Amino acid sequence: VQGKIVSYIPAWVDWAKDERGVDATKFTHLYYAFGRINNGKVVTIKEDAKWTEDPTITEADRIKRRNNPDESNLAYLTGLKAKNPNLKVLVSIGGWEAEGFSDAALTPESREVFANSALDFMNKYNLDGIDLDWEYPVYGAWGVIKSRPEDKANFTALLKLLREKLDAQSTTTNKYYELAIAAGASKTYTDSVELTKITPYLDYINLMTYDLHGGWDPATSHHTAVYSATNNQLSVDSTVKLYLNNGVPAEKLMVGGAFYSRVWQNVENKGTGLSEKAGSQAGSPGTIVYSELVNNYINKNGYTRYWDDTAKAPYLFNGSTFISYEDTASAAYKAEYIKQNNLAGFMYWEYSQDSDSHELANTIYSRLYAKSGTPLSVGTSVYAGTVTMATYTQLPAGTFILPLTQGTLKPVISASDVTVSGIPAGITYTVANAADHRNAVAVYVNGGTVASNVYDPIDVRVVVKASAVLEANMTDSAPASVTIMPKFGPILLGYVPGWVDWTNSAYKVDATKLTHINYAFARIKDNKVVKISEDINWVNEFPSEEIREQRRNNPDDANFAYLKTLKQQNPSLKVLVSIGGWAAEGFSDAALTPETREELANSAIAFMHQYGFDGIDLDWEYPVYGAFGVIKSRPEDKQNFTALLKLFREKLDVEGALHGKYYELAIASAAAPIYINSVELDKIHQYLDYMSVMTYDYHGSWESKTAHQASVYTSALSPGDFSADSVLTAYRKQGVPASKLVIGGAFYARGWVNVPNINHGLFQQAGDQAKNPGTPTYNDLVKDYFDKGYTRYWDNSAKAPYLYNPDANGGTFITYDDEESLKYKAEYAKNQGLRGVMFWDYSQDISGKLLGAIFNELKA
Ligand SMILES: CC(=O)N[C@@H]1[C@@H](O)[C@H](O[C@@H]2O[C@H](CO)[C@@H](O)[C@H](O)[C@H]2NC(C)=O)[C@@H](CO)O[C@H]1O
């Protein structure tokens, strides 16, 4: 990590007890806002008179202010060195309207008591440095604070001293300490401080290049723009130029940006509202934070979004309220300026004001640790990914929607900026910006009649061109995958295990809710597909003979007949054979040569015809890496798997053209990045009906830290971590159409014994893992857990349930899929244009609720 990122964080949130925590891997420094001065000395904000007594809400809030948890905050924040080692946490002193800088600084005497107490503060909370935010010396923000002309010098002296105290301490500790200032943007500020004396005492000067204009001005303008587009409009550029002219070296200047807007009301309804006269601001809230703009203002509630292309700043206007803000784009242009002009880094006030998802802080990081002159591509995610055929030929009016993940659409895109591949001919389509979204394309797909019958999903491909976007040197987007579904809708597929005698089980299979069954499994033996009772590895997994017998007399013939009655009873039901699965030997050998591939194909085709199947699922676990030596693997598996699949599909096309029927070919495929490496995902998919992605087994007893085994989304408390969302995005990134992906639900759990009672059990360091529960099924969970000690919590940013019991071996943490999570996996599949939903496995919920909740969302 090269240039710096400073993220001020407010003292007046509970960060320990916040739901989103802090992704401290996206900034370098973290200034804590603020400590204050009291009787000439640095202190916690909860000990500040003037801030504990704000009359805006003096009831429930003043209490919270006097008992403000800074101790907890500081401990939680420096604790984030866990996730980032490099991180620095400084204490920032002052802020807007913070009093007593002029008295504490005034005389050599009082400076001591302040600079001393400032170290006491730094030491006490184990902090990497001090930041003085005096606003402002000499002129006191024109009467907001106490001030006198002698500040000019005293500021200098105070700063010199602090540097002495912080180098003194360094020579014993071996840790260099940092000293910063936030510094005013105006010519007036530079005139009130001794810059060519001050610079050398400091590591960085935080230019506050915001609040450059606001409701105090008679006309609108940008408050935190990059460039000056008119003579009178201040900017990062004007301010940086002002500071270089006074000798301050580029290498120490941090450019500032803002996660909030400056607002004007009663603006003349002329032009765009930019540079228009403005009346009374007596009604005005003054600012609106970035999260609130996202939620209700940007392209919402009659507020049009605009861009000043010379200033490189966004603004909104509705005919009378104007709002000037920092967005994804303006941050891009500011990062670029830092790099263009060799500045120290990007500073921002402040972190809490970012969106739920941290859109700005993440944008800055991404832009600042891009390598220059090596263009970034436009990013896409999906919000609405499916339109569904009414009949075999009638397509209704529908609308796909794609938010940008990287880059920022012009407020009005032209057709040349988006190209749509794979709308079937006959059917007119339009592109545009999606209403009620800040930054998203809309392909409006008009009703129509398609030329021929639509039996299979159609992959629609959307390309977001560089000309669409506002940023500078950017390349076209990877062609994004959305889906026109056939009239029958998503598939819902159960893995049905062959080691249950379903003929005699009181618990039966629900062929009315499933579209698809995968009988698990067939196997490989001497390069032949055979029943599971022939595979010696399996039969002889355990020595004990009363198992081994059950294994040899596995009720395959029965179950195949049983499945035949399901098929007769429900004639659209498709039942397929899964060759392989965990510990299944034979695949690598079988894929080697054009002779060995031919053998297995023919033998698989013949197994399929003999016991009544509608297609094949291949379940190779796993190629090239062989699940880390469970399975003979080879580098050459990669291109072989792909010839195996190409072959199977050709044999199955032969079969189908002989039996007057369509045979399916499918694989199961893992989530791990090594799988995605080890397989030619871009190449194999054209041969498949879909991929049953195993969006589960993310974390187990093989780690000693708790985490979500099957989360539909990546929790906020574990950035980076596995989710269905992350994994299926990763799949599509490789080129796999959405309409050939299937999301996996798991009907069993995992867990860890010896989890400390912290945060309901969640993301904790684990203990000794002997007597770990292994994999209890939901059945097990119903009898022996749910009410029997344990308590069910829910992480809403992940949408994944979890159990903790303090009084059981540590206690224990359980991670699983349930009704609510399976619902969301199913919503995700409809929203994203996925082929369908899948699970493992039918025998693990005899109650039928997990299936019910997939079915109730996916189909009704
Ligand atoms: C580094 C920096 O920008 N410092 C100043 C900030 O304090 C100021 O933010 C304001 O801080 C006050 C505490 O001093 C808060 O009461 C107030 O709510 C907060 N304002 C906002 C919009 O979050 C910022 C922004 O005006 O500018 C500096 O002056």
Author numbering: 557 to 1416
Sentences reproduced from the published study:
Genomic and biochemical analyses of the FPU-7 strain have revealed that the bacterium secretes at least seven chitinases, one of which is a unique high-molecular-mass (150 kDa) chitinase, termed ChiW. This enzyme has three surface-layer homology (SLH) domains (~18 kDa); it is specifically expressed on the surface of the bacterial cell and degrades chitin. Based on comparative sequence analyses, ChiW has two glycoside hydrolase family 18 (GH-18) chitinase catalytic domains (~42 kDa each) and one carbohydrate-binding module family 54 (CBM-54) (~25 kDa), as classified in the Carbohydrate-Active enZYmes (CAZy) database. In this study, we have determined the crystal structure of the bacterial cell-surface enzyme ChiW and demonstrated that this elaborate monomeric enzyme is composed of six distinct structural domains.
Thus, two truncated mutant proteins have been prepared to determine three-dimensional structures, i.e., ChiW-SLHd (Val198 to Lys1418), lacking the signal peptide and SLH domains, and ChiW-CD (Val557 to Lys1418), which is composed of the two catalytic domains. The two monomeric proteins exhibit very similar hydrolytic activities for chitin. In the catalytic region, the three-dimensional structure of Cat-1 closely resembled that of Cat-2, consistent with their high degree of amino acid sequence similarity (56% identity). No major differences exist between the overall structures of the two catalytic domains and the amino acid residues at the center of the two active sites, i.e., Trp568/Trp1055, Trp652/Trp1138, Asp687/Asp1173, Asp689/Asp1175, Glu691/Glu1177, Tyr766/Tyr1252, Trp772/Trp1258, Trp905/Trp1396, are almost identical. Besides the core β8/α7-barrel, the ChiW catalytic domain has an additional two subdomains, an (α+β)-insertion domain and insertion domain-2. The two subdomains protrude from the core β/α-barrel and form the walls of a deep active cleft of approximately 42 Å in length and 26 Å in depth. In the solved structure, the two clefts cross each other at approximately right angles.
